[PDB]
Structures are given as C-alpha cells and as structure tokens.
Ligand binder design. Sequence first.
Ligand SMILES: *[C@@H]1O[C@H](CO)[C@@H](O)[C@H](O)[C@H]1NC(C)=O
Ligand SMILES: *[C@@H]1O[C@H](CO)[C@@H](O)[C@H](O)[C@H]1NC(C)=O
Ligand SMILES: *[C@@H]1O[C@H](CO)[C@@H](O)[C@H](O)[C@H]1NC(C)=O
Ligand SMILES: *[C@@H]1O[C@H](CO)[C@@H](O)[C@H](O)[C@H]1NC(C)=O
Lengths: 311, 145
Amino acid sequence: DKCKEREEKIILVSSANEIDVRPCPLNPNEHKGTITWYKDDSKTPVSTEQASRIHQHKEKLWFVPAKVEDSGHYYCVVRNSSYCLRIKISAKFVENEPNLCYNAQAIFKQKLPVAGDGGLVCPYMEFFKNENNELPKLQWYKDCKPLLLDNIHFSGVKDRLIVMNVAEKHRGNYTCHASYTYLGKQYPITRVIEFITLEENKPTRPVIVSPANETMEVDLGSQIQLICNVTGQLSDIAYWKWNGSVIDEDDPVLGEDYYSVENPANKRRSTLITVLNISEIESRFYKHPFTCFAKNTHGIDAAYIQLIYPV
Amino acid sequence: SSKMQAFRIWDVNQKTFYLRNNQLVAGYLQGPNVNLEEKIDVVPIEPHALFLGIHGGKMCLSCVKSGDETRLQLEAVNITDLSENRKQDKRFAFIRSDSGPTTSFESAACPGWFLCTAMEADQPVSLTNMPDEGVMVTKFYFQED
Ligand SMILES: *[C@@H]1O[C@H](CO)[C@@H](O)[C@H](O)[C@H]1NC(C)=O
Ligand SMILES: *[C@@H]1O[C@H](CO)[C@@H](O)[C@H](O)[C@H]1NC(C)=O
Ligand SMILES: *[C@@H]1O[C@H](CO)[C@@H](O)[C@H](O)[C@H]1NC(C)=O
Ligand SMILES: *[C@@H]1O[C@H](CO)[C@@H](O)[C@H](O)[C@H]1NC(C)=O
C-alpha cells in the first residue's frame, strides 16, 4: 500500500462506563495530512456523527462512553497529496475490580523522593479542556477514600496533587476524578495512580583511604609499588598522576594497573585499587609527589606520596 | 571513560522516557508498558559533567545543529569509547546542574540549550533555548539505580 504503516507498542488501558479519547500517536514530523480513523479492519472508517458512542471528532477517536467490548485495534491514517501513514493502535477497556474504585491494569506508577514537597499528575486530562482552556475540577481520593485538600498537607492545583513533606505514610493508590460535559450529557473521568516513595539515597563521593599525604624513604635505583586504595562505587575513577601529568603506556619505567573488589554487603562501598609499578627509582621522582585521584559526578578526592632519600 | 552506571529519570510532571520509532519520547506508562521505560547510562567525565546514553551505552544522546536548527538525537556509539579530549565527542556531554531535589542538563556542545520535555504527553524529548520560558519542562529527578 502507498502508506508507511506502523504499529504502536504502547497499549493504553482505560476504564469502562467513562468517556475516553485517543489521539493519533504521530511525531511532530508526521502532522502534514488529515487524520482518519478506522476500526479492526483498515477499510471500515469510524463513525463521524458525534451522536454515536465510538465516533471520531477533532482527529481523535472518542468513546462516549467506553465499554469493555470496545477493546481492540484501531487505525489512524495521515494522508496527503504525496504522503500516507497508517498507525495500528491497541485499546483496552477494563472495569473496576470487585468493590474497588479502580482496576490494577490501569495503574500509572508515579514516584517521589521523601522529605520534600512533590506532585502527582493526573495523566491525559489535556483532552478534556473546556473552550476557555481550563481543565475540569479534579477531586482526589486515596485508596478509594476521599482526600482532604486543605492546602496544608495536600493541594489540588490544576491537574496535579501537591503533597507537602513526602513520607512513607503517603503510599497508596490515588484516583483523580473529573466530569466532562460532552454534547449536553455529562460523563465521568478517572485515572488511577500508584504513589511510591523513594528513600533519598546519599550521593557518595570516592574516599581514598591510602595513601594519606605521607612520605616514603626509597633508595635510588630500586623498584617499588605505590598502591592507591579507594572506597566507593565500582564505577568510580581512580588513577595516578605525577607532576600534574598522567602515566602513559609509553613510559618504560612507569606502569599502572587497575583492579576492583565488589563489597558483598554494600556495593556503594567497594574497593578500587590502582597500583603504580615503578620499575626503577630515578632522580626526577624525588622532585614531585605521586598523587592519586578518585572522582565521579559528585566530587573528586586527592592524596599523595612524597618519595624521599633514606637518612 | 572508566565505567558507566544506570540511572532512572522522570521529569517533575512524572513523565518517563521510552522509544517511539527509534526516537526518545516522554509519556506516561501503565502497568504492562512499564518494561518500556528507558534508564539512562552515564559515564562521569568530571564532577558535574557526564555522557548520557541508553541501552547499555550502545546509543548516546547528542546535540547537533543543522545550520541553526539545534536538535537532540541518538547515535549508535558506545559510551565508553567517548573521550573528553576528542572535540567531536563534546556533543555527547552534558553539564549537570542541581536545584534541590531536581536536576537539569545543559548541552556541553550547545551552550544555553537544556534537555527538556513538553507539557503534552507522548512528545519527543528535545532541547530548549529558553529554560526561562517555562513552556517546556527542564527539571528532572535523576536517581542512580
Ligand atoms: C495498588 O493496588 C495494587 C493492586 O490493585 C496493589 O498491588 C498495590 O500494592 C497498591 N499500591 C500501593 C502503593 O499500595
Ligand atoms: C584496602 O582496604 C583496606 C584499607 O585499610 C585494607 O583492609 C586493605 O588491605 C587495603 N588493600 C590495599 C591493597 O590497599
Ligand atoms: C613537570 O615537571 C618538570 C620537572 O620535573 C617541569 O619542568 C615541567 O614544567 C612540569 N610540567 C608542567 C606541565 O608544569
Ligand atoms: C592531601 O593534600 C591534598 C592537596 O595536595 C589535599 O587536597 C588533601 O585534602 C590532603 N589530604 C588530607 C587528608 O588532608
């Protein structure tokens, strides 16, 4: 066919007995032609008369109201004098589980780190804005019981629920409810959101436990190994530097090796070792200290060893 | 450079990242589609500077300008093979700025352009020249797995 054809991986699950809207999932670069919807088979177009339940309006598929028997495939075609693309979407309509104000299959997972103030957003309400560009007044619930939006503990602003001082006690399945007036009639809207609290984990920085800005009596013409012992994530960068320069492979006297050991109790505190093998002590080595650097996104850490002649 | 680490990301409006026609987009994922969430693999250059990528660092995010059109794009380049000393590789680096509990990423190769998502769901992740405008979302929650 003279049309690109594409299938959407994302399957949106909606609630039955409620109004629902489905837009044609096209990237900005695919909005040149008019969109036209079709049902299970790419030849049968969806009704255009707003009076019927499943009908197309404003280039979107409307289920006024949606019913379980509507679960299936639909197609939206973007055609133009010299372009045509057909997307195969998948819609599924469920019903609230026994004595529950929602169905698990429609849960959107939303998380926030504790201690601070955060917000949950009632998904896909954008389609239901009145002609004056306002989203309908939402009423929030937590685990099917009403939620007091006292502007002190919870604040309902537009399409989001601002939660003051997130804590474990806020975990639960919230449901945002709304009522959209379509062609005189009024239909309900609900989205179930599972709120998960994240424990604020510390941004650990690499710690050099050895060397510790010390000196070492070494004889001329001998061979030594300078070991750098760092504690941190295995992903941390630990390396040696001499006179503000890094050890290059082309150095016939200075060769370094790297080896780390994972901590079986806490991966955040594993050991990273960087050994500097000095084949032979040269005069220049006593002129400047060997510095070991450890770093990551958070910060860097430095420690050195200053070689000295034995007294 | 050395090693990489997987991070979870989602903007302040709870949108997550996933691929649509091999193009990174932000939207809301439900139970079944939860597996489509893309984690961000990062390799730290220096503190507050890093390379961003997805799929085990097989593809990296970058900023390229066609004439004057600054755009974000995924390239098939292993994150570890990137070097801060190579001029071209600057396009894959971002500067991490932190505002309390949120983070923001500025393009190292395209100064002034920050990573952003749109208010409307299921839109591609892009770069904004005007973080002040507030029309696009520039704040995210960047947490290491
Ligand atoms: C939300 O409900 C599901 C089942 O419907 C349950 O497994 C889950 O634990 C609930 N979420 C929370 C945060 O309790
Ligand atoms: C590194 O970790 C600690 C440092 O005190 C010690 O138990 C271990 O032997 C050290 N190993 C090396 C090679 O420095
Ligand atoms: C490295 O050390 C040498 C002397 O040991 C010095 O002449 C040189 O300038 C140093 N390198 C830099 C970049 O300063
Ligand atoms: C070691 O010296 C460096 C500067 O050369 C400094 O940054 C570091 O904090 C020192 N280490 C200690 C334990 O004081």
